[PDB]
């Protein structure tokens, strides 16, 4: 406790940004500065110094987003979790030059969900996210609004973007893509919640809705409350579960979102915390013990948001016979594993095991080739993708663009109930995962979809593939 200041900063709330009268939204990508622990640091942000707004979209309504790159280097803008055509997907092919402008029209056609957006610059995604770039996407539809969930933005409906950073002694963000981070990821000893260190949020009595995003480059998290009151999971990456799922702890992989309701009953403050995980590098101090994320400070007013018995209906799993099967093998060059582990041991000592690297991470023996999509999927068809991490012991949250899928097997076991709805990420760690995926939109070679590990340093050093989606593919044509 003595390590944190007695008074907590107020939890910053990203602005909720909707369409203007011309059905447009403006996003600037820029460099500014932020203060962490009383030290100012250069940071990057969308419409601001750090992080970004929550872009709010209505299902079935078109928006054009005008994107202005005001950095001195190239970037891209990817809408993580959005079912949109490859042309507006903002993967590594969607380059926006410094001083450049690109406009994309999003025709939102998926269930209400909390998605997010971030850079996807080839080989530099880890650095650009670490510098500060990430924003949220709130998709709404008539269905979710009829539920009368907690819905006062920044009061009882609260975005919670949780990220670690490593800072140097001069206060600046200390990012590196090197042999150690290419192996185990970039991680640090300071946890940010909407950009603030251990902030406090003033919560009315009643249900409090938290839209949780693990926005770390490489660190997996496991949310719980300080007094072990339950979290009611109401939504995953791609939207509402069929019914709330009660959990006492909530593991969240890099890039995943969950929305939870937690009870604010009496006046006693309590914390959202993250519990120690079993992931290389990640249980090193200060994360060897439960670590505070946010203080919830009850206030006098009440709020009347509901915890509904029923939230939504999801389609039953279809027959799996006859469906196209795609096999993806994740791998790391053994030299990278050896050297990266050596560096981790040098940097942290014995506690690290207490419980050309630029193309050394691979899928099906291939480090990402932006000019060679690995295959073509058929639009509108359910496919079974089988992703294996047998062979190494690293954690790979495997993410597929252009879709919200259904997990069939997560790392060799059936998915937990709260992970059996709409997901865009599945854990792969020394075992095999299978997902049921359908692509509703096209993506040509020039604007292909990505499928990749979302441990950003793995992605940046090769663990990504491109794929196209069209109505059909036949070699004669
Ligand atoms: Cu994505
Ligand atoms: Cu990985």
Instruction: Tell me, briefly, the overall form.
Output: globular
Oligomer: monomer
Q: CATH superfamily of the largest domain, please? A: Cupredoxins -  blue copper proteins
Question: Could you name the CATH class of the largest domain?
Answer: Mainly Beta
Using the coordinates shown, work out and report the CATH topology of the largest domain.
Immunoglobulin-like
Rounded radius of gyration (Å): 21 Å
Bound ligands, each once: copper (II) ion
Topology, number of strands: 30
The CA-CA distance between the termini, in Å, is 66 Å
Q: Can you give the helix content as a percent range?
A: under 10%
Binding site for Cu cation 4: 396, 453, 458
Catalytic activity: 4 Cu(+) + O2 + 4 H(+) = 4 Cu(2+) + 2 H2O
Subcellular location: Periplasm
Cofactor: Cu cation
Summed up, what is this model?
With 477 residues, the protein is mostly beta strands. Helices cover 8% and strands 40% of the residues.
């Amino acid at each position: 406790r003595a390590v944190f200041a007695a008074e907590r900063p107020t939890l910053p709330i990203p602005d909720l940004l909707t369409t203007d009268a011309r059905n447009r939204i403006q996003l600037t990508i820029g460099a500014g500065q932020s203060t962490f622990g009383g030290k100012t640091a250069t940071t990057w942000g969308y419409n601001g110094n750090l992080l970004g707004p929550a872009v709010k979209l209505q299902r079935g309504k078109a928006v054009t987003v005008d994107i202005y790159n005001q950095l001195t280097e190239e970037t891209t803008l990817h809408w993580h979790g959005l079912e949109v055509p490859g042309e507006v997907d903002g993967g590594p092919q969607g380059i926006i030059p410094p001083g450049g402008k690109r406009s994309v029209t999003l025709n939102v056609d998926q269930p209400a969900a909390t998605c997010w957006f971030h850079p996807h610059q080839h080989g530099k995604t880890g650095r650009q996210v670490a510098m500060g770039l990430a924003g949220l996407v709130v998709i709404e539809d008539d269905e979710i609004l009829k539920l009368m969930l907690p819905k006062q933005w920044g009061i009882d409906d609260v975005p919670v973007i949780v990220q670690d950073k490593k800072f140097s002694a001069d206060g600046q963000i200390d990012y590196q893509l090197d042999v150690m981070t290419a192996a185990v990821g970039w991680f640090g000893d300071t946890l940010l919640t909407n950009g603030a260190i251990y902030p406090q949020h003033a919560a009315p009595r009643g249900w409090l809705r938290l839209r949780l995003l693990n926005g770390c480059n490489a660190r997996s998290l496991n949310f719980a409350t300080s007094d072990n009151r339950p979290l009611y999971v109401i939504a995953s990456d791609g939207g509402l579960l069929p019914e709330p799922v009660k959990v006492s702890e909530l593991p969240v992989l890099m890039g995943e979102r969950f929305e939870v309701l937690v009870e604010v009953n009496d006046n006693k403050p309590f914390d959202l915390v993250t519990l120690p995980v079993s992931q290389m590098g990640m249980a090193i101090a200060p994360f060897d013990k439960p670590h505070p994320v946010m203080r919830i400070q009850p206030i006098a007013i009440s709020a009347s948001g509901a915890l509904p018995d029923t939230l939504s209906s999801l389609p039953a799993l279809p027959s799996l016979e006859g469906l196209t099967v795609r096999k993806l093998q994740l791998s790391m060059d053994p030299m990278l594993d050896m050297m990266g582990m050596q560096m981790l041991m040098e940097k942290y000592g014995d506690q690290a095991m207490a419980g050309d690297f630029h193309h050394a991470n691979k899928i099906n023996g291939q480090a990402f080739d932006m000019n060679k999509p690995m295959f073509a999927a058929a639009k509108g068809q359910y496919e079974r993708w089988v992703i294996s991490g047998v062979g190494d012991m690293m954690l790979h949250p495997f993410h597929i663009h252009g879709t919200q899928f259904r997990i069939l097997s997560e790392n060799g076991k059936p998915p937990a109930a709260h992970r059996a709805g709409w997901k865009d990420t599945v854990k792969v760690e020394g075992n095999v995962s299978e997902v049921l995926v359908k692509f509703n939109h096209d993506a040509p070679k020039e604007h292909a979809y990505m499928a990749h590990c979302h441990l950003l340093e793995h992605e940046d050093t090769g663990m990504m593939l491109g794929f196209t989606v069209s109505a059909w593919s036949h070699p004669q044509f």
